[PDB]
């Protein structure tokens, strides 16, 4: 019913690690999209709620998720931003799809264990 922050973090962290461990597929996701540096000023017109692995880890590390679904929501947010913004055959889009494949395989038992 109520989750202890360090147990939530401990349960969920392996699924985040699984994504980080994807090389090269995690690489575009390990840090926030910076549209200024990238010269893509349209990015925040399309992606209103940016999300990336570094931000997810920080939130997981600083008790910012009270329930497991808020974490799942952020991972899906990351994916959905990338699938909306990028070409289907782009490196980023293909990479994202791999992260989603890994995440689907990792999350389901963890959500089962958590209740």
Residue numbers in the entry: 1083 to 1197
Quote the study on this structure:
Bromodomains (BRDs) are protein interaction modules that specifically recognize ε-N-lysine acetylation motifs, a key event in the reading process of epigenetic marks. The 61 BRDs in the human genome cluster into eight families based on structure/sequence similarity. Despite large sequence variations, all BRD modules share a conserved fold that comprises a left-handed bundle of four α helices (αZ, αA, αB, αC), linked by loop regions of variable length (ZA and BC loops), which line the Kac binding site and determine binding specificity. The four helices form a deep cavity that is extended by the two loop regions (ZA and BC loops), creating a largely hydrophobic Kac binding pocket.
Indeed, ITC experiments showed that the binding affinity of many BRDs was significantly increased for multiply modified peptides. For example, the KD of CREBBP decreased from 733 μM for H3K14ac to 131 μM for H3pS10K14acK18ac suggesting that many BRDs recognize a pattern of modifications rather than a single Kac mark.
